[PDB]
Design a protein around this ligand. Sequence first.
Ligand SMILES: CC1(N)CCN(c2cnc3nc(Sc4cccc(Cl)c4Cl)ccc3n2)CC1
Length: 493
Amino acid sequence: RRWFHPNITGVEAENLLLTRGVDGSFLARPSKSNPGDFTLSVRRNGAVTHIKIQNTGDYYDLYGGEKFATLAELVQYYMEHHGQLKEKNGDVIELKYPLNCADPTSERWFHGHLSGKEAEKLLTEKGKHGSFLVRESQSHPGDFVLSVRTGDGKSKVTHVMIRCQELKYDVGGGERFDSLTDLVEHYKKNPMVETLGTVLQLKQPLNTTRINAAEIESRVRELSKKQGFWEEFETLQQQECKLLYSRKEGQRQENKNKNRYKNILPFDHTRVVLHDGDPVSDYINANIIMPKKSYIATQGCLQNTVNDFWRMVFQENSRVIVMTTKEVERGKSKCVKYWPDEYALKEYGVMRVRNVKESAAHDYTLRELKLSKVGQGNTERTVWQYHFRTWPDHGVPSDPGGVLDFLEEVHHKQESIMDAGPVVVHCSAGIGRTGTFIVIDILIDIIREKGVDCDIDVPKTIQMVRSQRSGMVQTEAQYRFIYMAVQHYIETL
Ligand SMILES: CC1(N)CCN(c2cnc3nc(Sc4cccc(Cl)c4Cl)ccc3n2)CC1
């Protein structure tokens, strides 16, 4: 993900492309005018074009282009679909040459100001064999140190000096690298060997995000001090080029119109496969998400996917559905009404649904549904639809109390139902709000059964969920809200 530059301005992007790029070179960067948005900066015929990318919480919206689940999938799409990106006037913008960033601030292993002994205590406490980090040198300004743990007495910490000479980095001899990232990547593949023989293997960065549950308030205070939240979120975003798993089934011609957004697709390896269809009937835009409960993350139904939605719910034995959007928000349709009116009964293809009773709370409506296969009364089961209604049109809720009390009720419903399947969670595209609810539920469930004596690692949890559906958790404001929800839950114990 070298083409994303987290700390550059528009002017700096123009100069970088004009002095170090060619026609077809590109980078992406956060938008300094509109916080939370991003800009694609592309060079063409010796001129730079800036293309705005919005994310209000549901997807990345490329102005004059399509909607995507991550910046990496967006870049992958246009680099592999030439003449697909059109401009203002309608002319082709070619993304050909990523312009690599040299900034290490978004790398998991870069700690900046850190003493040799502070790094030793961190590596002693949370480090493993091959855990490493890079820090500024405390004696030679402008130089850095690579601190590695290999392995009382059986393990050690080795400090390797990295000198910076003319904006090139080296470990005292050999090759000179254009960035710390290149240096780390090289000595990851070609590990340094010590004179006496020890191999300084760079296996994984030192974890700094896993904390004890009781430490959340302190960590939140730290991140609240360009704030730590932004830095941690962007570092997580920098890992998304590891998650470009294939989505071939969703791109098939017969499945295209089963997607609310043509380029927001389920990974083939975790997609819910619909099994006994009408003699392509196996496709729905949905993924299994596994952390005790499992989830299905899915989009709001389209008119032509309501039948497939109920086949999924039936086949997977799901007994709880969590809907996190209104049907209509800001005059836009985000989910068709896939359930009957209270007391009514409808057939959706071969599936029959009765709306038994609705119960309203302030934050949500609960719909007691009875689902069965037509022609087979012995297949009936109750499906409890929790329709969250108070998520704001802009941003995230200011207080997590409503979301937390909602998930607490959903969790107890699920736990009270013997052998219930995954909980279905959906919004519009099924990645932003849907990922946020699912991540909070996963973290809360650890604390619910372990109290404060448990580790929580928010970005690791998100990355694990992002490997099972694209772009789970869309924004920094959602990232922050997840931390705020976890803090509030721990405090009300
Ligand atoms: C100052 C920093 N440069 C950025 C902030 N700060 C870090 C450090 N690791 C981070 N790591 C992640 S993602 C992840 C987390 C756990 C386990 C696994 Cl496997 C993954 Cl992939 C997401 C944000 C981070 N943020 C320390 C270094």
